[PDB]
């Protein structure tokens, strides 16, 4: 059974630019994803000032359905970005059976961030929780701050890339990297 429980948590706050960027990234993600009649269930969740849910995990059964759902969930704005709340609300309120989650077959959590960790305590608690439950966490960084010089964006996103103690090459990716998405699927083939 090549099925698995996947959740994608996106932010559309003021730190994020035109939603066409993330929908294009999600487009390429879902395109490469093998969403068959009963395999690869992907739920899209949006966060910011709160966590909104538009679609459920088992609300679709085709690449086309999930692809349309991904570009259908457009965030018009967000007062703030709370990365820690995105991870928290995903493993409970998105990975719940009533929301279309399975019996716990390969819990994949993909989250995007720009660099705004105002509280490392909440995210570390969710991290240690998902680490004990051996959840496959993937963090993608989006660059959209224009960059008016070498301000060292590496020192801004470093806070989120340190979430995973495992190799960053299989956990931390970029929106402008399509091979990153391939790296996810190839390593998702394993049990962990």
């Amino acid at each position: 059974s090549t099925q698995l429980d996947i959740v994608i948590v996106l932010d559309g706050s003021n730190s994020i630019y035109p939603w066409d960027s993330v929908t294009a990234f999600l487009n390429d993600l879902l395109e490469r994803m093998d969403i068959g009649p009963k395999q690869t269930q992907v739920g899209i969740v949006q966060y910011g000032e709160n966590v909104t849910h538009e679609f459920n995990l088992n609300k679709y059964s085709s690449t086309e359905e999930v692809l349309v759902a991904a570009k259908k969930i457009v965030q018009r704005g967000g007062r703030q970005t709370m990365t820690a709340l995105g991870i928290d609300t995903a493993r409970k309120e998105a990975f719940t059976e009533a929301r279309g989650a399975r019996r716990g077959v390969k819990k994949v959590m993909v989250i995007v961030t720009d660099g705004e960790s105002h509280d490392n305590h909440r995210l570390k608690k969710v991290i240690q929780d998902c680490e004990d439950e051996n959840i496959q966490r993937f963090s993608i960084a989006i660059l959209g701050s224009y960059n008016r010089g070498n301000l060292s964006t590496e020192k801004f996103v470093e806070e989120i890339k340190s979430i995973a103690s495992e190799p960053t090459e299989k956990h931390f990716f970029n929106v402008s990297d399509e091979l990153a998405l391939v790296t996810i699927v190839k390593t998702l083939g394993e049990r962990i």
Partner: peptide
């Protein structure tokens, strides 16, 4: 002429100042 749409949003604020001794 019809006006355009809202411009691009602002980026995250700068890091806070160092704490006291």
């Amino acid at each position: 002429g019809p006006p355009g749409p809202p411009g691009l949003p602002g980026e995250n604020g700068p890091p806070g100042p160092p704490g006291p001794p």
